[PDB]
C-alpha cells in the first residue's frame, strides 16, 4: 500500500482540525477541486490544481510513493488557496491554519 496508510492517518488528523466558531473541518474546501462551472477561471488561473482527494488517490495508485511528494502536493494546494482567495477570507484562513498543522506533522515524522 506504500505510503497510503500513513497519508490516510494524516488526512484524518487534518479533518479533526475544526473551526473554533462553526466547527467546520478546515479540510472542507480542500477535499476536491472547484467545479469548472462555478469557477470558470480557476483552471486558467491555477497552473497545478491539487486537492485532498487527488492526494489520496495518488498515494493509492503509486503516483506518490514518498512523504516528500505528499508534502510538495499539500504545499501547492495551500499556495493555490492563498493565491486565489482574499486574505482573511475563510478559505485563506483555513489554508494557513492547516498548513501550520501539517508543517508540525511533517517535522514530527521526519
Amino acid at each position: 500500500l506504500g505510503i497510503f496508510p500513513t497519508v490516510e492517518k494524516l488526512v484524518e488528523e487534518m479533518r479533526e482540525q475544526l473551526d473554533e466558531v462553526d466547527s467546520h473541518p478546515r479540510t472542507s474546501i480542500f477535499e476536491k477541486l472547484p467545479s469548472k462551472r462555478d469557477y470558470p477561471d480557476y483552471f486558467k488561473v491555477i497552473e497545478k490544481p491539487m486537492a485532498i482527494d487527488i492526494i489520496l488517490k495518488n498515494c493509492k495508485n503509486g503516483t506518490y510513493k514518498t512523504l516528500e511528494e505528499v508534502r510538495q502536493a499539500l504545499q501547492t494546494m495551500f499556495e493555490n488557496a492563498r493565491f486565489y482567495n482574499e486574505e482573511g477570507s475563510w478559505v485563506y484562513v483555513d489554508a494557513d491554519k492547516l498548513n501550520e498543522f501539517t508543517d508540525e506533522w511533517f517535522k514530527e515524522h521526519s
Partner: peptide
C-alpha cells in the same frame, strides 16, 4: 473564520484581469 454561508470561495478581484 466561519465558513461563508453558501460554502463558496472568495476569489480575489485582481484575478479578473489575469
Amino acid at each position: 473564520t466561519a465558513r461563508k454561508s453558501t460554502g463558496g470561495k472568495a476569489p480575489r478581484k485582481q484575478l479578473a484581469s489575469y
